[model samples]
Target chain A: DDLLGDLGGTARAERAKLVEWLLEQGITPDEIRATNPPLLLATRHLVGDDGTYVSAREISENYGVDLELLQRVQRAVGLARVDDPDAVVHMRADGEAAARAQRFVELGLNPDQVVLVVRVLAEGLSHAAEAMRYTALEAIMRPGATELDIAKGSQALVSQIVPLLGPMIQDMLFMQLRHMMETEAVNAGERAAGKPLPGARQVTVAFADLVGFTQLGEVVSAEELGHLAGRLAGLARDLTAPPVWFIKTIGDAVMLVCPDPAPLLDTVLKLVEVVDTDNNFPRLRAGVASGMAVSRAGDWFGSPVNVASRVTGVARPGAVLVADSVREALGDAPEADGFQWSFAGPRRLRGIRGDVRLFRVRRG
Target chain B: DDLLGDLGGTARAERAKLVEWLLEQGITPDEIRATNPPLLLATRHLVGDDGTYVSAREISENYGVDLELLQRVQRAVGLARVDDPDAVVHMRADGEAAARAQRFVELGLNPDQVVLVVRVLAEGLSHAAEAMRYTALEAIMRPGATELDIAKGSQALVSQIVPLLGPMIQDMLFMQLRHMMETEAVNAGERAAGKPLPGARQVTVAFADLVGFTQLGEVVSAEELGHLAGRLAGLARDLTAPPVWFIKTIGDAVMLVCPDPAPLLDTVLKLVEVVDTDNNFPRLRAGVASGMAVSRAGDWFGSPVNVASRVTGVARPGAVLVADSVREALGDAPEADGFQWSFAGPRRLRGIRGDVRLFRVRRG
Candidate 1:
């Protein structure tokens, strides 16, 4: 019984702090209690009852308090009249009483909005007594002179009601925004039906190959193989520019096409430079060709794309080879000096009857 | 335009359907033609100066399309030499040509898993003629298939992949009890600090109220007078049972008491009869007075509560009322003559200072 009293005291002392915390978190007390009436009633009943039977009159006498005072106390915390059958109804009919009923309702409230309200109310009531005490002191410190004035002020201050308008309104907005984002994402994905790619234009193609990928795969687990493929694909995609679209990645090789040769050349060089910088993977060899290529279904096709891959196969690891077509396309570009081109003598690539020349681009 | 021919008749039919729908939804064929590579390439370069494109020559002569059938069709989907830089590299390295690149990727395909795999491949090949067609079909049907099948069906589908195991595993346990009462109601009022009321027990007090609350509110709002007080109060707190510790209300009255009244006569009668009847707010009112009243902070108090208000004033709107002392201490166990009664009668009442009688009973 003593423990119960102490617990009650502690709950009362912490009430204000609880309310403040709830407010900070954007919850309102009255809103929560309004939807959860029964809970507040039950809690009040538990707190007021000890073990033995004691009449209302007897308790008043025992505590040396008047019946009206006791009744007022009971009313504040949601206790009904000992005799009134319609106490809750009567209480709910009155605005103040209804507000208290609202507090109880808030306790049982659901949905995010109601929950926030309940949280605020619970916090406010938890340290209500302490807040009341502090308010009493503050009232005394004011320039009020009379004892009657102090008494009147104290009654209003001790009532323990605090406004929760600020927090509740704020949280409602946040919930609304979250709901909007979820719906928007779903809508956007659904509407993006096979939207066509832009018109085909002449573009430069860059190809890079991890030498002996099939051989390496034999030594790696299926998971490792997948991981390596994903890593290389991600790197290639990230390094490319806006017009530089990733075409397709075949086991050990990746292809990209760009409308501008300068950016494609830049990306290819960086890719070669980073190949051995990260020792996790085998070095890569690259080749570039600039000409008309069909960019279809996100992949590029045609002779220029084919030659780039052939050249890459012949290049040494960490080396970049370019077709004369791409070198000529560079045409007086200032960054052309960045490449040290060595022309390879004319050779017939398989499937192509005519001789084609390849040039090695050495590191500056 | 050229690629449109290569889509095969069935694919072309589907594409037509999509195009018609797109136009209906405000998209034009020109929008599609402008973005498709094969059509763009065929129109700009493959066509002769006579404004005729040698699509058949491009497909059969250059791409190895069957020449015998090719001449029968004046126009065909354009097939260019793999001159695109990236396509050149890919075609040359493996001795494969541009026209055969897609076929090589499809050589090891599984038919059953075709839908899933095709969708996966469409992720990267979103703009490819064949890939886009396959993706559209998969998007329409893939929700009903297995992930592995989807994965293997389309190479592009791989990009849209996410682990499916987690949600599936959680659903196993969650689906059955997701909205069950035990799971939902158990924590329904957690925010309000309301605990569940236990089963019928020897606890002080029970209250009952009626329906028609909406009508009652209308009445109150119109009259603005405090008429129908008894009926209104009865509507408010009567439904609360022994577990609720029915306390007395002040004017319309409420009833309350402490300690479990599970075995108490008044408590049982309130639950089983009177309020349980179908006459809306049936005549029934009772309050238990047992256990000492304790006062918590604020307006809450509890103890040997006065149940008379709820029992006599509010419950049943117009019927019997009993107090805990009168019901429990009543000596005579009245006959169950339709209206059975166990009574303690003719007692001097507190506050009123008059003889008051009470009983725990059921209606005849």
Candidate 2:
């Protein structure tokens, strides 16, 4: 009565009645007072009927999964962790996630493997969810929107978006898988024919980075720095195609790999020249090494991968360096005619055995 | 028969029989010869039961969405595009995706808005799919595995993973939404009370980045550089709690925002110190500015956002710089006891009018 006493009689009565309903739904007075009480009530529908929550311990125990393992997986997947295992922070949807996590374990994934998959999937999906949030909010966050307006809008959008996204996600994955399987088929055939060594293939790997990228971070706004990095990724993607894969991008660097040295080296030389001539961006330095390497989950490992990186570290900005192996592999190849090569001399690299011979390449 | 004639007598017979089955199913002879023929047949089941393909034009015409809009959306979402609209490249799943894209349009999203949502979702989901691919492949790519082993294993994993991932994706999104709504509720109340102007809130925004990150890129392996950038993201995530949001990470920099300046400033100070003490990483420079800013899709926009970024550009490495507004907002706040401040003097910032007063802070 006292809390409602400041309002007019009619308004007080409305408030008292609304408070009664919200309290019954388990919303505390403090929680209700912290935000728009009515909006809180409306958005509760997104969780589940009645919006009940259970503790992490309860979920782990109920799903028959180890509590520590469950917690670790959740953290790895980028979910917020509560210090107390008994804290009631999870909704029914979360329990369903736990149940599915257990299902993966039953299907032959060890605990470590489950975390690996969950981490990668979460990293990717979280970005997607954040992206969708803007549009989802925009649909309801119109000027003059009332609590009911947002409530009704959010609920309607979620229902339609979820079902639609699931099928679309599956479709995209299959498309990616089709492309991935093409390579797998080739690798399998090579193995069956005793062509390449088991689990290792002779490939050319290159590492490239924007010179002075770190220093640029200091002089530009972080957002501008972000845009620059994103542009670098865009350029790398545009330049590489299968046979030449744009492996991945780090903060300011990109990795590229190919089965043949000639085309890979050609791409690197062109990549350097392209960035160098562009006044809008920094110059690039790249190193190309060719040798046996292993592929794991779309990433490469081996001497060539490491050597290419070390070789890149020492190359001059706006230039390309190739290991002797790459030079040997490219001998007499038609693409070699596009560049003039000069000996870069023997240099010892950290973590690499012995001195490595490299050649600097310039456009013919 | 001529192509199959190279096989042993019994093998040739089996090859001819299987070739007939595949050709009828639309697998070309050239495609079959390029890979493990049997594996290609098996993986085809992932696309569709019959593995039928249609042209982009056919999908656009059937779905009633404009071809240009569809192409733009596809490209923005990071999907590969065929130059020829009549090229037979889309599977049933792609057509289904096209259908869903139309549904979004029917549900009040304009075509441009649809593209925005799709682009963001695709960016995130694509990462998730790539991560899952490694785990999915591991279940089948055992040592010396035969084509049959891979085909059957991939099929089983896809069926189970897709269903499990859809539900998990929804659950995580809601969890994120629940937290997001907590802030929304407060914003709504403030709006209702006419506390802040429409769509603008007083916020303290900070921009932070590792010193010499780009320079480090030239000396380190691309993978190592990637890990360093990743580690910075991890550090930022660990430090930010709700009320203080870690907005985003662009290759080398991070954006953090909070409604209050005190806690936000403290976090920046601590974040810098934490990075500086770590032997494995570079020092950090951050700029803090407090004023009106608008939130968009988990990012911020406005003068303060721009100002903080510009301020960060001029800060000395291993130091914190705050705009005058932040200093005024923090006056007499208890957290100030932990810091010593000196005026950075009035200075002209690019694109920002007037000379803005600034202060540099260090540990007490």
**Model 2 Cα lDDT, one tens digit per residue, A1-364:** 4354455654455566666655665766655664444644544554443456688888877777778777776666555656577888766556556556777766765566677666655655555554455556656565554444455566667666656655565655554545443333335455344322235567889999888665465466555665576677767665664457666665467888888876677788888899988877889999889876655444565568767888998999988988898887776776526678899999987656578898998775
Model 1, A205-296: lDDT tens digits are: 88887765543533554335445655676577556644455655654477777777777887888887887697778888898887654433
Model 1 TM-score relative to the real fold: 0.27
Chain A structural similarity (TM-score) per candidate?
0.44, 0.73
Worst 10 residues of 2 chain B by lDDT: B189-198
Question: What does the lDDT read for residue B166 in candidate 2?
Answer: 53
Which portions of model 1 miss their true places by more than 4 Å? A1-200, A334-337, B1-364
What 10-residue stretch in candidate 2 chain A is worst by lDDT? A190-199
Each model's TM-score, in the order given?
A: 0.27, 0.65
